[PDB]
Every structure is written in structure tokens, then in C-alpha cells.
């Protein structure tokens, strides 16, 4: 029992209600994604503003990012992108994806070239998620900073309105930290304003931003929202989601690089079970879907609501065993991961380059 | 002890800051005769008076610059200025005159940084206001006669967004300097904006050749020489320790003393002060007026006294100004000896100075008028220079 209602108030966000979900549905003319109608993406901030702009034929855009990783990207990392891809499709709005290679360089043991390299590679995985090349700008901080007539200006503006004491509290920086880490929050914030991308929005500063993110990141995004009116820009809207369960609750998680046999082995051997120790005692008391990692993953990926609920009931009653549940998950992940690998393999250096080239979108 | 940093120059001494002593504190090298000669031979020209008179008395690795030069290996100059709305006085000319001379005798490329972003961060203006001041000051800079074909003047706000190498070097430098370190060097506090805290990386960046691909392609081995009053040393003592950590050569330095304030050599000429400066905008009348009515005097209070005791050149601002702008050495020594003897009276010894400063300020004001927008724009345009 995690409890997210104690978080909506802890941060001051606005819990998304069955009422808000309906306006989205009416505005998009499509059934709400399962993350919504399942509470994956529960809370938000200013979502109604976005709809106001949209319904009244006024465009808005999406912003999300990732810290280029030299390591593997697991299924958990897909949640944000899947939702953003959906938002992008149903609203048909531009999307900018920031690869914070400068950030990784500042925090990890990498040369500037290696950081950039990890960014271009992670870019393939992101493109693999299926984003439309005609309305998605994926950019490396290291590359785009030197080719934007608006980005650095916004960074300087933000840097002037944020003090060390403020970032010390929000991010825990110390006196021993390099000056690059200390001013980085401005780089991460700048993408929230439309005129940071002249090639896409030009001089416009009204096209509001929408940022899908994790609930426990709301404090960080508060900095950006607080600086917005201070420098004359609309605050970016937010859509919060729950956390992704850890495997145990190496084999730390299921990476998008694992094979069918690897997935199978990870689940059946490491997926934390909320079921009983013996098959006799399990049918006796049932399983706990609340803490059963295997079922939790199903809530994220299994798209059939009925098929999902049926599993919850059976596992809870004790009818379905753990190994059987694990088989239900493995049969959903293998094709998930499999398809990702296929799409990624078809992403050429040409395609990557086009996604990462500042240009007019549609 | 004296106090000099990128923002303030204070001393309880009339004879000004104690150089040869600041050389130790800052840990630098004295420019000796041997070096002066080496520069004469390498350039086939007479050493500028700043060197001849000890105006530029300190250096860092000038010998490495010469080693390279004498071996057909290029090098470039870098200096800059924080744009202002009304500033830009005579004292400012010192590093720009010397830089211009270095550019002409060595015939090397030069980049000049206008820190409009620094001003935007430390002042209370808008981006457009900061950039505006950058352009205006560019006119004054160009007026010193820098060769358009070998000089790149750039606004940080503008160049940062159009350089495939500037920002990457900012980031590199940023990783190798701690808040703690910038606290000790520049005295920043936890209350300052993050922009101020990381700014030192932006001023260090021009010290490296690949920050300017349009000029040096992708070469990282082009030695850099930074002529600057010694008040800009902090930025570069920091930059020098960082250089090898990011695989670049350390920038060389040539330190100039401070142009005394009208009221006295206790501070450097500062536009931030009421009437301690002779601005490059002052009319011929304002110049003589400020010299007579404000230029501190080292000559006895009265003529009788002056005749018997003489005058102190070490503290007379008028004479100090002459060591900077009176080109003729013998004439300078004659004025020195006569003022020291009493033969010459404080009585418009200032006249001599006024005869020097008036044409000086006038020549600049004139050349400044010739600065067209097509001109400023060409200077501030990233482009290949007259080299390879
Ligand atoms: N009273 C004085 N007497 C003699 N020289 C003086 C006096 N006051 C100023 N200077 C010199 O003038 C140059 C510009 O000063 P700034 O304060 O604009 O300079 C600034 O505020 C820097 N952030 C701009 C900068 C960027 N890169 C550089 C590289 C070298 C030197 C300067 C820069 C400087 O060379 C300075 O030493």
C-alpha cells in the first residue's frame, strides 16, 4: 500500500478526477489512455489551461527529456515516453526532447565526446518509441546551445532569477560542487519556454508547455514554474504519474536489451511475489496485488482492462498461482521488448540526425 | 595590504598599488630587460613605451608565446570589456592600445569579448539593453584602429547561440571549478544567482582556440596571450589551472599597472566614481578643466616652496598620466627632472599633459565617428580571419 493521495496534498498538486479525464476525451475525440483510466498519471498542474488553449484552436507543446545513459534503459523508463507519444498523437502538437549530455558530463566520469555519444544512442531508443518525425525535435544540449538564438538567452534570464540557496534546498548542492552543476537547473528549465526554439516557434512566447513527469519531481518543476511569471512567460503545465515498481521490490530490472529467455528468467526468478510461500497456503489466502511486482507491471503494460481485472481477482482469491501470474506478464513483456528492439534496429544514423536537426515542424 | 580584484582597486598609498609586490601575491613573473629585448628581436620593432617604462611589468609564460612565434607557430590575442551605458574612460585605453600594438607588431588574430551577459547578471537591465551597450562599446573599441581583417569582437549573448565550440568549452571549464573556489577567488556568496556563480567559466572560455572554430577550425594548440590590467588575473590564474585538465595549453598573460584616478593613485580610474575619470567623450574644454581643477598634485602647495623643494613625481597624477601617454622618453625624463628640480611648476605641468590628452581624446572621438553599422556588424560577425 503506497498511497498517493497523501502526495497530492504533500506537494499541493491537483489530483486528476474522472471529471478532468472526460474533458480530455471530449477535446481529443479518443478514449483516454490506460495510464489515465487507471491512475498511473493521477495528479497535475494547470492541465485545464492547456485545454483552454487547445479547445480554442490555440497550439501548445510537449517537453520531456532524459539523461543520456551509457547503460541499458529498462521498461520503467518507457512509461513517460509512451504517455507523451499518446498525448502527441491525440493532440497532434510539437514535442521537444532534451538529452542532457552536458548534465551527464558534469556528474559522471565521461569525456564531453562520450557524453554526446550516449545521447545520440539513447536517442535511437526514444525514436524507437515511435514519435512522429514531423513534429518531434530531439536535441542535445551540447549541440543545440550553440545553434539557437533563443535558448541561451532564456538560460541567462533564469540564471539571474535563481540563487544558490534556492538550488541548495531543491537539489541539495554543496560548496564542493562544481559551478556547472549549480547552474544546470537553468538549462533544464529553459526548454519550458517556446522562444527557446526559434526554428519551431520563432519569437512567440505564449504557446504554453506541457510536461509529463513523475509526482516526486514536482518540487524540482516548482522552480521553473515560479520563475516563469518573473521573466514574463506562462508556467508549464504538469501531469504527474506514480512510481514504477522495482523488480526485487544485474537482475535489478528488465532492460530493453534483454532477450525473451532473459525476460522469462528475470520474472520467474526475481519478480517479487505477493503470493504465499506454498501452493496450498496460496489458494488458502490468495495473493496481494498491491505489492506483487508481477501484477503491478501488468497495470502498466497489459492494455486489456477486463483481462487485467480478471487476473487481479483470480490472483487475490488464490485461484491463479504466482508462477501462472508470472507467465501472464512474461507473455506481455517479451512482445513489448521484442517490438522495441525491432523498431530501434530500423533507426538509421540518417533518421537520428533528422530528428536532432533544428527545423520547422508540423 | 593593497586590494585588487576584477571589481575593485584600493590602496592606502599615494604612490599607488605596490607592484613588484603584487607580482608575488598573485604569483607571476617580472618582465625584465632580457625579455624586452627578446620581444624586440622577435618583432623587429622598438618595444612599446608601456614595456619600456614598466606599465606592463608582469607576465605569465610570455616566453612560451615567443618560443612559438620564433618557430612560425601562430598565437592569438584575447581581451575584452564589460559593456557600459556611459563608462569608457582614458584608463580603459591602456590595454586596448597595448593589444593594438601587439596585434600590429606580431600580426596575430585577436578576439574581443563583450560580456553583456555578465552586465545583465550584475546590473539591472534587460537583455536588449545589455546587448545594446555591447554594440556601442564596440564602436569605441574599433576606434583604436584594430585591423578589421584580424579582429573578432563578440557579444556573449549573441555568440553563445551561434558557436559550435564556445559553449562546449564553457561546460568543460564549469566541471573543473568549484563553488568553493569561485568563493575564494571572486568572493561570491550563497545568496548570489546561479548565473553569477558560473560566469567565470564564460570569461575563461575565450582562452581556448577551439571556442572559435570559424577562426581556428578545430585546432586546440593555438597558444593564447591575454593583455589585461592585472585586475583580470583572477579569471586567468583559475583558467590556467583548468587548461591542462581539459587538455588545452594555458593562456599567457601580460599584466599592466593601473591608470590612477584623478584625485589620486589610491584607486584606478573608475567610471563608477563621481569625478575621477576623463571620459572618451569629454570635450577639449572638459579635459583641461578636469586636469587643472582635479588632477592631484605632487608639487608643493606654493611656488616659493615648489622652487626650493621641488615636486614629487611618484604621487603627481599629472606626471603619472604622462608616463602613459607622452611617447617621447627623453622629453618625459626632462619633465621629470625639471619637476623634481622645481624648475618646472605644478603650474600647468598639466599644460604639457593637457597638450597630450586633448589630441588623444580628439583623435579617438574622430575615428569613432567613422565607425559605421556595416563596420561594427562586420567586426562582430563570426568569420575566418586573415590567417590559417
Ligand atoms: N583604471 C584602469 N586602468 C587600466 N586598465 C583598466 C582600468 N580599468 C579597466 N582596465 C582594463 O580595461 C579592460 C576592460 O575593463 P572591463 O572592466 O570592461 O573588463 C571586464 O569587465 C571583463 N569581464 C571583460 C573581459 C572578458 N575577457 C577579458 C580578457 C581580458 C581582459 C578583460 C576581459 C580590462 O582589460 C581591464 O584590465
Short mmCIF file of N, CA and C in Angstrom, two decimals, chain B residues 132-251:
data_model
loop_
_atom_site.label_atom_id
_atom_site.label_comp_id
_atom_site.label_asym_id
_atom_site.label_seq_id
_atom_site.Cartn_x
_atom_site.Cartn_y
_atom_site.Cartn_z
N UNK B 132 22.67 46.13 -26.40
CA UNK B 132 22.80 47.48 -26.94
C UNK B 132 24.12 48.11 -26.52
N UNK B 133 24.41 48.04 -25.23
CA UNK B 133 25.65 48.60 -24.70
C UNK B 133 26.85 47.90 -25.32
N UNK B 134 26.70 46.62 -25.63
CA UNK B 134 27.79 45.85 -26.22
C UNK B 134 28.17 46.45 -27.57
N UNK B 135 27.16 46.74 -28.38
CA UNK B 135 27.39 47.32 -29.69
C UNK B 135 28.04 48.69 -29.58
N UNK B 136 27.47 49.56 -28.75
CA UNK B 136 28.03 50.89 -28.56
C UNK B 136 29.51 50.86 -28.20
N UNK B 137 29.87 50.06 -27.19
CA UNK B 137 31.27 49.96 -26.78
C UNK B 137 32.13 49.42 -27.91
N UNK B 138 31.52 48.61 -28.77
CA UNK B 138 32.26 48.05 -29.90
C UNK B 138 32.79 49.21 -30.74
N UNK B 139 31.97 50.23 -30.92
CA UNK B 139 32.38 51.40 -31.70
C UNK B 139 33.64 52.00 -31.11
N UNK B 140 33.66 52.21 -29.80
CA UNK B 140 34.83 52.76 -29.12
C UNK B 140 36.07 51.88 -29.32
N UNK B 141 35.88 50.57 -29.23
CA UNK B 141 36.95 49.59 -29.37
C UNK B 141 37.55 49.63 -30.77
N UNK B 142 36.68 49.60 -31.77
CA UNK B 142 37.09 49.63 -33.16
C UNK B 142 37.87 50.91 -33.45
N UNK B 143 37.50 51.99 -32.76
CA UNK B 143 38.16 53.29 -32.95
C UNK B 143 39.66 53.25 -32.69
N UNK B 144 40.12 52.30 -31.89
CA UNK B 144 41.54 52.19 -31.59
C UNK B 144 42.31 51.70 -32.82
N UNK B 145 41.59 51.53 -33.93
CA UNK B 145 42.22 51.11 -35.16
C UNK B 145 42.57 49.64 -35.34
N UNK B 146 41.84 48.74 -34.67
CA UNK B 146 42.12 47.32 -34.83
C UNK B 146 41.88 46.91 -36.27
N UNK B 147 42.72 46.03 -36.80
CA UNK B 147 42.54 45.58 -38.17
C UNK B 147 41.27 44.73 -38.28
N UNK B 148 40.34 45.19 -39.11
CA UNK B 148 39.07 44.51 -39.32
C UNK B 148 39.31 43.08 -39.80
N UNK B 149 40.38 42.90 -40.56
CA UNK B 149 40.71 41.59 -41.11
C UNK B 149 41.31 40.57 -40.15
N UNK B 150 41.61 40.98 -38.92
CA UNK B 150 42.22 40.07 -37.95
C UNK B 150 41.62 40.18 -36.56
N UNK B 151 40.50 40.88 -36.44
CA UNK B 151 39.88 41.09 -35.14
C UNK B 151 38.40 40.67 -35.08
N UNK B 152 38.06 39.86 -34.09
CA UNK B 152 36.69 39.41 -33.92
C UNK B 152 36.17 39.94 -32.60
N UNK B 153 35.15 40.79 -32.66
CA UNK B 153 34.56 41.35 -31.46
C UNK B 153 33.24 40.62 -31.29
N UNK B 154 32.97 40.11 -30.10
CA UNK B 154 31.73 39.37 -29.93
C UNK B 154 30.96 39.58 -28.64
N UNK B 155 29.64 39.57 -28.78
CA UNK B 155 28.77 39.69 -27.64
C UNK B 155 28.56 38.27 -27.14
N UNK B 156 28.69 38.04 -25.84
CA UNK B 156 28.46 36.71 -25.28
C UNK B 156 27.04 36.25 -25.58
N UNK B 157 26.07 37.13 -25.32
CA UNK B 157 24.68 36.79 -25.55
C UNK B 157 24.42 36.37 -26.98
N UNK B 158 25.14 36.98 -27.91
CA UNK B 158 24.93 36.66 -29.30
C UNK B 158 25.78 35.49 -29.79
N UNK B 159 27.05 35.46 -29.40
CA UNK B 159 27.94 34.40 -29.87
C UNK B 159 27.65 33.03 -29.30
N UNK B 160 27.26 32.98 -28.03
CA UNK B 160 26.97 31.71 -27.36
C UNK B 160 25.95 30.88 -28.14
N UNK B 161 25.02 31.55 -28.81
CA UNK B 161 24.00 30.83 -29.55
C UNK B 161 24.36 30.50 -30.98
N UNK B 162 25.57 30.85 -31.41
CA UNK B 162 25.95 30.56 -32.78
C UNK B 162 27.34 29.98 -32.94
N UNK B 163 27.87 29.38 -31.88
CA UNK B 163 29.22 28.81 -31.94
C UNK B 163 29.22 27.31 -31.63
N UNK B 164 29.78 26.51 -32.53
CA UNK B 164 29.82 25.07 -32.33
C UNK B 164 30.87 24.66 -31.30
N UNK B 165 31.58 25.64 -30.74
CA UNK B 165 32.60 25.31 -29.76
C UNK B 165 32.64 26.11 -28.46
N UNK B 166 32.10 27.33 -28.48
CA UNK B 166 32.15 28.19 -27.28
C UNK B 166 31.52 27.52 -26.05
N UNK B 167 30.25 27.15 -26.15
CA UNK B 167 29.54 26.52 -25.02
C UNK B 167 30.20 25.22 -24.54
N UNK B 168 30.63 24.37 -25.48
CA UNK B 168 31.27 23.13 -25.07
C UNK B 168 32.46 23.45 -24.18
N UNK B 169 33.19 24.53 -24.47
CA UNK B 169 34.31 24.84 -23.61
C UNK B 169 33.81 25.42 -22.28
N UNK B 170 32.70 26.15 -22.31
CA UNK B 170 32.17 26.68 -21.04
C UNK B 170 31.89 25.48 -20.11
N UNK B 171 31.18 24.48 -20.64
CA UNK B 171 30.83 23.29 -19.87
C UNK B 171 32.06 22.61 -19.31
N UNK B 172 33.08 22.41 -20.15
CA UNK B 172 34.32 21.77 -19.70
C UNK B 172 34.94 22.48 -18.52
N UNK B 173 35.06 23.80 -18.64
CA UNK B 173 35.64 24.61 -17.58
C UNK B 173 34.75 24.54 -16.33
N UNK B 174 33.43 24.59 -16.53
CA UNK B 174 32.47 24.52 -15.43
C UNK B 174 32.64 23.29 -14.56
N UNK B 175 33.05 22.18 -15.17
CA UNK B 175 33.24 20.96 -14.41
C UNK B 175 34.47 21.00 -13.52
N UNK B 176 35.43 21.86 -13.87
CA UNK B 176 36.65 21.89 -13.12
C UNK B 176 36.90 23.06 -12.17
N UNK B 177 35.82 23.73 -11.78
CA UNK B 177 35.92 24.83 -10.82
C UNK B 177 34.76 24.65 -9.85
N UNK B 178 35.06 24.68 -8.56
CA UNK B 178 34.02 24.51 -7.55
C UNK B 178 33.48 25.86 -7.07
N UNK B 179 32.30 25.81 -6.46
CA UNK B 179 31.66 27.00 -5.92
C UNK B 179 32.60 27.52 -4.84
N UNK B 180 33.20 26.59 -4.11
CA UNK B 180 34.11 26.95 -3.05
C UNK B 180 35.26 27.78 -3.61
N UNK B 181 35.81 27.32 -4.74
CA UNK B 181 36.93 28.00 -5.39
C UNK B 181 36.57 29.40 -5.88
N UNK B 182 35.38 29.52 -6.47
CA UNK B 182 34.91 30.79 -7.01
C UNK B 182 34.54 31.72 -5.86
N UNK B 183 34.38 31.12 -4.68
CA UNK B 183 34.05 31.88 -3.48
C UNK B 183 35.33 32.56 -3.02
N UNK B 184 36.43 31.82 -3.07
CA UNK B 184 37.71 32.34 -2.66
C UNK B 184 38.27 33.36 -3.62
N UNK B 185 38.13 33.09 -4.92
CA UNK B 185 38.64 33.99 -5.95
C UNK B 185 37.83 35.28 -6.08
N UNK B 186 36.53 35.15 -6.30
CA UNK B 186 35.65 36.30 -6.51
C UNK B 186 34.76 36.73 -5.36
N UNK B 187 34.83 36.03 -4.23
CA UNK B 187 34.00 36.40 -3.10
C UNK B 187 32.50 36.32 -3.29
N UNK B 188 32.02 35.33 -4.04
CA UNK B 188 30.57 35.18 -4.23
C UNK B 188 30.01 34.58 -2.96
N UNK B 189 28.70 34.72 -2.76
CA UNK B 189 28.05 34.17 -1.57
C UNK B 189 26.87 33.29 -1.99
N UNK B 190 26.37 32.49 -1.05
CA UNK B 190 25.25 31.59 -1.30
C UNK B 190 23.99 32.34 -1.69
N UNK B 191 24.03 33.66 -1.57
CA UNK B 191 22.87 34.48 -1.89
C UNK B 191 22.87 34.95 -3.34
N UNK B 192 23.99 34.76 -4.04
CA UNK B 192 24.08 35.19 -5.43
C UNK B 192 23.30 34.28 -6.38
N UNK B 193 22.93 34.80 -7.55
CA UNK B 193 22.20 33.99 -8.52
C UNK B 193 23.17 32.97 -9.13
N UNK B 194 22.63 31.84 -9.60
CA UNK B 194 23.49 30.81 -10.16
C UNK B 194 24.26 31.33 -11.36
N UNK B 195 23.67 32.28 -12.07
CA UNK B 195 24.32 32.87 -13.23
C UNK B 195 25.64 33.54 -12.88
N UNK B 196 25.68 34.24 -11.74
CA UNK B 196 26.90 34.91 -11.30
C UNK B 196 27.95 33.88 -10.92
N UNK B 197 27.50 32.84 -10.23
CA UNK B 197 28.40 31.79 -9.78
C UNK B 197 29.13 31.05 -10.90
N UNK B 198 28.48 30.88 -12.04
CA UNK B 198 29.13 30.16 -13.12
C UNK B 198 29.75 31.06 -14.17
N UNK B 199 29.50 32.36 -14.06
CA UNK B 199 30.04 33.28 -15.07
C UNK B 199 31.55 33.19 -15.33
N UNK B 200 32.37 32.91 -14.31
CA UNK B 200 33.81 32.81 -14.53
C UNK B 200 34.19 31.84 -15.64
N UNK B 201 33.33 30.85 -15.90
CA UNK B 201 33.59 29.89 -16.95
C UNK B 201 33.44 30.58 -18.30
N UNK B 202 32.50 31.51 -18.41
CA UNK B 202 32.30 32.22 -19.68
C UNK B 202 33.50 33.12 -20.03
N UNK B 203 34.15 33.71 -19.04
CA UNK B 203 35.31 34.55 -19.36
C UNK B 203 36.58 33.72 -19.59
N UNK B 204 36.59 32.50 -19.07
CA UNK B 204 37.76 31.67 -19.26
C UNK B 204 37.72 31.06 -20.66
N UNK B 205 36.53 30.72 -21.13
CA UNK B 205 36.36 30.07 -22.43
C UNK B 205 37.09 30.68 -23.64
N UNK B 206 37.11 32.03 -23.76
CA UNK B 206 37.80 32.61 -24.92
C UNK B 206 39.29 32.28 -24.96
N UNK B 207 39.83 31.84 -23.83
CA UNK B 207 41.25 31.49 -23.73
C UNK B 207 41.63 30.27 -24.54
N UNK B 208 40.67 29.62 -25.17
CA UNK B 208 40.99 28.41 -25.92
C UNK B 208 40.58 28.48 -27.37
N UNK B 209 41.53 28.17 -28.24
CA UNK B 209 41.33 28.27 -29.68
C UNK B 209 40.10 27.63 -30.28
N UNK B 210 39.69 26.45 -29.81
CA UNK B 210 38.51 25.88 -30.45
C UNK B 210 37.18 26.50 -30.03
N UNK B 211 37.23 27.51 -29.17
CA UNK B 211 35.99 28.21 -28.82
C UNK B 211 35.60 29.03 -30.05
N UNK B 212 36.53 29.14 -31.00
CA UNK B 212 36.31 29.90 -32.23
C UNK B 212 36.66 29.06 -33.46
N UNK B 213 35.79 28.09 -33.82
CA UNK B 213 36.02 27.22 -34.97
C UNK B 213 36.10 28.00 -36.29
N UNK B 214 35.25 29.01 -36.42
CA UNK B 214 35.22 29.83 -37.63
C UNK B 214 36.58 30.47 -37.92
N UNK B 215 37.38 30.65 -36.87
CA UNK B 215 38.69 31.27 -36.99
C UNK B 215 39.84 30.26 -36.99
N UNK B 216 39.82 29.34 -36.04
CA UNK B 216 40.88 28.35 -35.91
C UNK B 216 40.46 26.92 -36.27
N UNK B 217 39.33 26.80 -36.96
CA UNK B 217 38.84 25.48 -37.36
C UNK B 217 38.59 24.62 -36.12
N UNK B 218 39.41 23.59 -35.94
CA UNK B 218 39.26 22.71 -34.80
C UNK B 218 40.56 22.57 -34.04
N UNK B 219 41.50 23.47 -34.29
CA UNK B 219 42.79 23.41 -33.62
C UNK B 219 42.66 23.83 -32.15
N UNK B 220 43.34 23.09 -31.28
CA UNK B 220 43.32 23.34 -29.84
C UNK B 220 44.71 23.67 -29.35
N UNK B 221 45.66 23.75 -30.27
CA UNK B 221 47.04 24.01 -29.92
C UNK B 221 47.49 25.45 -30.16
N UNK B 222 46.56 26.34 -30.49
CA UNK B 222 46.94 27.72 -30.72
C UNK B 222 47.08 28.50 -29.42
N UNK B 223 48.32 28.75 -29.02
CA UNK B 223 48.65 29.50 -27.82
C UNK B 223 47.84 30.79 -27.76
N UNK B 224 47.43 31.18 -26.55
CA UNK B 224 46.66 32.41 -26.35
C UNK B 224 47.40 33.36 -25.41
N UNK B 225 47.36 34.66 -25.72
CA UNK B 225 48.02 35.68 -24.89
C UNK B 225 46.99 36.72 -24.49
N UNK B 226 46.87 36.95 -23.19
CA UNK B 226 45.87 37.87 -22.68
C UNK B 226 46.44 39.12 -22.05
N UNK B 227 46.39 40.25 -22.78
CA UNK B 227 46.89 41.52 -22.27
C UNK B 227 45.73 42.05 -21.46
N UNK B 228 45.99 42.42 -20.22
CA UNK B 228 44.92 42.95 -19.40
C UNK B 228 45.55 43.60 -18.19
N UNK B 229 44.86 44.58 -17.61
CA UNK B 229 45.38 45.19 -16.40
C UNK B 229 45.44 43.98 -15.50
N UNK B 230 46.30 44.00 -14.50
CA UNK B 230 46.44 42.85 -13.62
C UNK B 230 45.16 42.53 -12.83
N UNK B 231 44.13 43.37 -12.95
CA UNK B 231 42.88 43.14 -12.22
C UNK B 231 42.03 42.02 -12.83
N UNK B 232 42.43 41.54 -14.00
CA UNK B 232 41.71 40.46 -14.66
C UNK B 232 42.49 39.15 -14.51
N UNK B 233 43.51 39.16 -13.67
CA UNK B 233 44.33 37.97 -13.45
C UNK B 233 43.57 36.80 -12.80
N UNK B 234 42.77 37.08 -11.76
CA UNK B 234 41.99 36.03 -11.07
C UNK B 234 41.35 35.05 -12.06
N UNK B 235 40.60 35.60 -13.01
CA UNK B 235 39.94 34.79 -14.03
C UNK B 235 40.91 33.86 -14.75
N UNK B 236 42.14 34.33 -14.95
CA UNK B 236 43.11 33.56 -15.69
C UNK B 236 44.08 32.71 -14.90
N UNK B 237 44.18 32.94 -13.59
CA UNK B 237 45.01 32.10 -12.76
C UNK B 237 44.16 30.84 -12.59
N UNK B 238 42.84 31.04 -12.60
CA UNK B 238 41.88 29.95 -12.49
C UNK B 238 41.88 29.19 -13.83
N UNK B 239 41.79 29.94 -14.92
CA UNK B 239 41.78 29.36 -16.26
C UNK B 239 43.04 28.54 -16.52
N UNK B 240 44.19 29.03 -16.04
CA UNK B 240 45.46 28.34 -16.25
C UNK B 240 45.53 26.98 -15.52
N UNK B 241 45.00 26.91 -14.30
CA UNK B 241 45.00 25.63 -13.58
C UNK B 241 44.05 24.64 -14.28
N UNK B 242 42.96 25.16 -14.85
CA UNK B 242 41.99 24.32 -15.54
C UNK B 242 42.48 23.77 -16.90
N UNK B 243 43.14 24.62 -17.68
CA UNK B 243 43.65 24.27 -19.01
C UNK B 243 44.17 22.84 -19.21
N UNK B 244 45.20 22.44 -18.45
CA UNK B 244 45.70 21.08 -18.64
C UNK B 244 44.71 19.96 -18.31
N UNK B 245 43.73 20.25 -17.46
CA UNK B 245 42.71 19.28 -17.07
C UNK B 245 41.73 18.98 -18.19
N UNK B 246 41.66 19.88 -19.15
CA UNK B 246 40.80 19.68 -20.30
C UNK B 246 41.64 19.58 -21.57
N UNK B 247 42.93 19.31 -21.38
CA UNK B 247 43.86 19.13 -22.48
C UNK B 247 44.19 20.30 -23.38
N UNK B 248 44.18 21.51 -22.84
CA UNK B 248 44.49 22.69 -23.63
C UNK B 248 45.70 23.42 -23.08
N UNK B 249 46.36 24.22 -23.92
CA UNK B 249 47.51 24.95 -23.40
C UNK B 249 47.02 26.11 -22.53
N UNK B 250 47.76 26.42 -21.48
CA UNK B 250 47.43 27.53 -20.59
C UNK B 250 47.64 28.86 -21.31
N UNK B 251 46.71 29.81 -21.12
CA UNK B 251 46.85 31.12 -21.76
C UNK B 251 47.99 31.92 -21.12
#
